[PDB]
Scaffold this active site. Structure first.
Site, PDB file in Angstrom:
ATOM      1  N   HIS A  62       7.964   4.619  -1.088  1.00 32.80           N
ATOM      2  CA  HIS A  62       8.574   3.268  -0.798  1.00 32.80           C
ATOM      3  C   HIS A  62       7.937   2.178  -1.679  1.00 32.80           C
ATOM      4  O   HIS A  62       8.577   1.165  -1.970  1.00 32.80           O
ATOM      5  CB  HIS A  62       8.415   2.879   0.691  1.00 32.80           C
ATOM      6  CG  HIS A  62       8.826   3.951   1.648  1.00 32.80           C
ATOM      7  ND1 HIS A  62      10.156   4.366   1.791  1.00 32.80           N
ATOM      8  CD2 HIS A  62       8.105   4.691   2.514  1.00 32.80           C
ATOM      9  CE1 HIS A  62      10.233   5.317   2.700  1.00 32.80           C
ATOM     10  NE2 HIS A  62       8.988   5.545   3.165  1.00 32.80           N
ATOM     11  N   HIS A  92       0.046  -3.841  -1.277  1.00 37.98           N
ATOM     12  CA  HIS A  92       1.183  -3.253  -1.981  1.00 37.98           C
ATOM     13  C   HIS A  92       2.115  -4.371  -2.400  1.00 37.98           C
ATOM     14  O   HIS A  92       1.865  -5.549  -2.082  1.00 37.98           O
ATOM     15  CB  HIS A  92       1.964  -2.267  -1.100  1.00 37.98           C
ATOM     16  CG  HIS A  92       2.507  -2.959   0.111  1.00 37.98           C
ATOM     17  ND1 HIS A  92       1.783  -3.120   1.243  1.00 37.98           N
ATOM     18  CD2 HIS A  92       3.683  -3.556   0.338  1.00 37.98           C
ATOM     19  CE1 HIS A  92       2.480  -3.776   2.141  1.00 37.98           C
ATOM     20  NE2 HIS A  92       3.681  -4.068   1.617  1.00 37.98           N
ATOM     21  N   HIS A  94       6.433  -5.415  -3.421  1.00 37.52           N
ATOM     22  CA  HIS A  94       7.904  -5.223  -3.442  1.00 37.52           C
ATOM     23  C   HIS A  94       8.403  -5.843  -4.747  1.00 37.52           C
ATOM     24  O   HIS A  94       7.951  -6.948  -5.072  1.00 37.52           O
ATOM     25  CB  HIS A  94       8.530  -5.867  -2.225  1.00 37.52           C
ATOM     26  CG  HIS A  94       7.939  -5.421  -0.935  1.00 37.52           C
ATOM     27  ND1 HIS A  94       8.516  -4.385  -0.232  1.00 37.52           N
ATOM     28  CD2 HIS A  94       6.819  -5.792  -0.266  1.00 37.52           C
ATOM     29  CE1 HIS A  94       7.815  -4.202   0.881  1.00 37.52           C
ATOM     30  NE2 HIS A  94       6.768  -5.033   0.886  1.00 37.52           N
ATOM     31  N   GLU A 104      10.655 -10.507  -1.055  1.00 38.29           N
ATOM     32  CA  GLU A 104      11.192 -10.341   0.312  1.00 38.29           C
ATOM     33  C   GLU A 104      11.423 -11.739   0.892  1.00 38.29           C
ATOM     34  O   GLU A 104      12.593 -12.099   1.176  1.00 38.29           O
ATOM     35  CB  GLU A 104      10.206  -9.481   1.087  1.00 38.29           C
ATOM     36  CG  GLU A 104      10.032  -8.093   0.478  1.00 38.29           C
ATOM     37  CD  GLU A 104       9.805  -7.051   1.542  1.00 38.29           C
ATOM     38  OE1 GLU A 104       8.734  -7.140   2.205  1.00 38.29           O
ATOM     39  OE2 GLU A 104      10.637  -6.149   1.671  1.00 38.29           O
ATOM     40  N   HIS A 117       1.705  -8.126  -0.796  1.00 31.76           N
ATOM     41  CA  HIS A 117       1.327  -8.123   0.623  1.00 31.76           C
ATOM     42  C   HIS A 117      -0.087  -7.576   0.750  1.00 31.76           C
ATOM     43  O   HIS A 117      -0.272  -6.337   0.498  1.00 31.76           O
ATOM     44  CB  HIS A 117       2.305  -7.279   1.425  1.00 31.76           C
ATOM     45  CG  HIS A 117       3.636  -7.926   1.499  1.00 31.76           C
ATOM     46  ND1 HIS A 117       4.756  -7.221   1.821  1.00 31.76           N
ATOM     47  CD2 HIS A 117       3.992  -9.216   1.294  1.00 31.76           C
ATOM     48  CE1 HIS A 117       5.791  -8.051   1.794  1.00 31.76           C
ATOM     49  NE2 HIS A 117       5.379  -9.294   1.480  1.00 31.76           N
ATOM     50  N   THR A 196       8.075  -5.524   7.258  1.00 32.15           N
ATOM     51  CA  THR A 196       9.380  -5.630   6.544  1.00 32.15           C
ATOM     52  C   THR A 196       9.991  -4.279   6.204  1.00 32.15           C
ATOM     53  O   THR A 196      11.081  -4.263   5.576  1.00 32.15           O
ATOM     54  CB  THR A 196       9.231  -6.443   5.269  1.00 32.15           C
ATOM     55  OG1 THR A 196       8.467  -5.629   4.368  1.00 32.15           O
ATOM     56  CG2 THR A 196       8.674  -7.831   5.528  1.00 32.15           C
TER      57      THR A 196
HETATM   58  N1  LIG Z   1       5.704  -4.733   4.062  1.00 29.90           N
HETATM   59  S1  LIG Z   1       4.666  -4.947   5.284  1.00 29.90           S
HETATM   60  O1  LIG Z   1       3.453  -5.493   4.724  1.00 29.90           O
HETATM   61  O2  LIG Z   1       5.341  -5.716   6.296  1.00 29.90           O
HETATM   62  C1  LIG Z   1       4.318  -3.342   5.964  1.00 29.90           C
HETATM   63  C2  LIG Z   1       5.416  -2.549   6.243  1.00 29.90           C
HETATM   64  C3  LIG Z   1       5.249  -1.324   6.837  1.00 29.90           C
HETATM   65  C4  LIG Z   1       4.006  -0.852   7.157  1.00 29.90           C
HETATM   66  C5  LIG Z   1       2.872  -1.616   6.848  1.00 29.90           C
HETATM   67  C6  LIG Z   1       3.036  -2.879   6.238  1.00 29.90           C
HETATM   68  C7  LIG Z   1       1.501  -1.084   7.160  1.00 29.90           C
HETATM   69  C8  LIG Z   1       0.779  -2.231   7.827  1.00 29.90           C
HETATM   70  C9  LIG Z   1       0.735  -2.070   9.175  1.00 29.90           C
HETATM   71  C10 LIG Z   1       1.403  -0.818   9.613  1.00 29.90           C
HETATM   72  C11 LIG Z   1       1.508  -0.009   8.292  1.00 29.90           C
HETATM   73  C12 LIG Z   1       2.635   1.023   8.155  1.00 29.90           C
HETATM   74  C13 LIG Z   1       2.612   2.186   9.208  1.00 29.90           C
HETATM   75  C14 LIG Z   1       2.439   3.447   8.639  1.00 29.90           C
HETATM   76  C15 LIG Z   1       2.101   4.558   9.397  1.00 29.90           C
HETATM   77  C16 LIG Z   1       1.896   4.423  10.766  1.00 29.90           C
HETATM   78  O3  LIG Z   1       1.565   5.483  11.574  1.00 29.90           O
HETATM   79  C17 LIG Z   1       2.064   3.189  11.370  1.00 29.90           C
HETATM   80  C18 LIG Z   1       2.488   2.116  10.606  1.00 29.90           C
HETATM   81 CL1  LIG Z   1       3.193   0.849  11.542  1.00 29.90          CL
HETATM   82  N2  LIG Z   1       3.901   0.349   7.906  1.00 29.90           N
HETATM   83 ZN   LIG Z   2       5.202  -5.272   2.243  1.00 27.73          ZN
END
Ligand SMILES: NS(=O)(=O)c1ccc2c(c1)[C@H]1CCC[C@H]1[C@@H](c1ccc(O)cc1Cl)N2
Ligand SMILES: [Zn+2]
Length: 258
Positions: A62, A92, A94, A104, A117, A196
């Site tokens: 992603h 990371h 986007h 975003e 981010h 997001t």
């Molecule tokens: N674009 S962002 O910065 O809004 C963004 C988007 C998606 C995810 C994250 C950050 C990171 C930060 C917190 C959860 C983690 C992740 C996730 C992965 C594996 C997991 O077991 C849990 C979680 Cl929730 N998903």
């Molecule tokens: Zn992000």
């Protein structure tokens, strides 16, 4: 048939697996600069990254994630709208297929070429897994990229991307100093929102810096050589990995500045 950014699995599809996609505090949003109110009670942001320990860089299918040792209070975000201490876990980006899209968040409907981010979790919840279940679990520092002059502090990231071209590839990435990705000003907008990407959990205090960083055309071109696919699968370029602006609903965006 996993979520992604294609025609058949992109942001308009995510609500079927993640119904919170249509929730009350989804990210990102358009920042209407004329409607955001100055909140003279907001404290200045505290960004303490001088002890930051980077470990690894990962293509997760992603985006690419630069991961940090968050097993102690090394790199932390505090002040601004935040109560307590948030620990840096990863950053990371986007980005777009063209310089005119990629961010975003938007500013008066303007799209930047990319968005960084810096992700931080609230140390009163003990681990990131617990934090994402809380309305105040995360603080994400969002920084806009525009194309112009190179960002020298980004080049160590750009040059390792050859080594993580495809989904599931990781490389050692020690001694990277994220202070090299920050603009001069810490002036910001803040609002309550969400992750997001799936699982789109409503656990984020967003802190979006007003001042973009400049990166070179060659720097963003290297982001666009990455792959969404795994090794030995048909090549699909990692571009336009951004969710569009979501309805503001019952929320106020606050400004740290006049
Ligand atoms: N674009 S962002 O910065 O809004 C963004 C988007 C998606 C995810 C994250 C950050 C990171 C930060 C917190 C959860 C983690 C992740 C996730 C992965 C594996 C997991 O077991 C849990 C979680 Cl929730 N998903
Ligand atoms: Zn992000």
């Amino acid at each position: 048939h996993h979520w992604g950014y294609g025609k058949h699995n992109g942001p308009e599809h995510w609500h079927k697996d993640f119904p919170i996609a249509k929730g009350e505090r989804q990210s990102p949003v358009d920042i209407d600069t004329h409607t955001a109110k100055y909140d003279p009670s907001l404290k200045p942001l505290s960004v303490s990254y001088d002890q930051a320990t980077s470990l690894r860089i990962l293509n997760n299918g992603h985006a690419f994630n630069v991961e940090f040792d968050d097993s102690q209070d090394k790199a932390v975000l505090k002040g601004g709208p935040l109560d307590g201490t948030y620990r840096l876990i990863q950053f990371h980006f986007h980005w777009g297929s063209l310089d005119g899209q990629g961010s975003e968040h938007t500013v008066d409907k303007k799209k930047y070429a990319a968005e960084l981010h810096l992700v931080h979790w609230n140390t009163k919840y003990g681990d990131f897994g617990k934090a994402v279940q809380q309305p105040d679990g995360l603080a994400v520092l969002g920084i806009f990229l525009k194309v112009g002059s190179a960002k020298p502090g980004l080049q160590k990231v750009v040059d390792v991307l050859d080594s993580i071209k495809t989904k599931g590839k990781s490389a050692d990435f020690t001694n990277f100093d994220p202070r090299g990705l920050l603009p001069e000003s810490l002036d910001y907008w803040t609002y309550p929102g969400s992750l997001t990407t799936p699982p789109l959990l409503e656990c984020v205090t967003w802190i979006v810096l007003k001042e973009p960083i400049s990166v070179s055309s060659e720097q963003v071109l290297k982001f666009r050589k990455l792959n969404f696919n795994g090794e030995g699968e048909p090549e699909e370029l990692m571009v336009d990995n951004w969710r569009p602006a979501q309805p503001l609903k019952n929320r106020q965006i606050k400004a740290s500045f006049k």
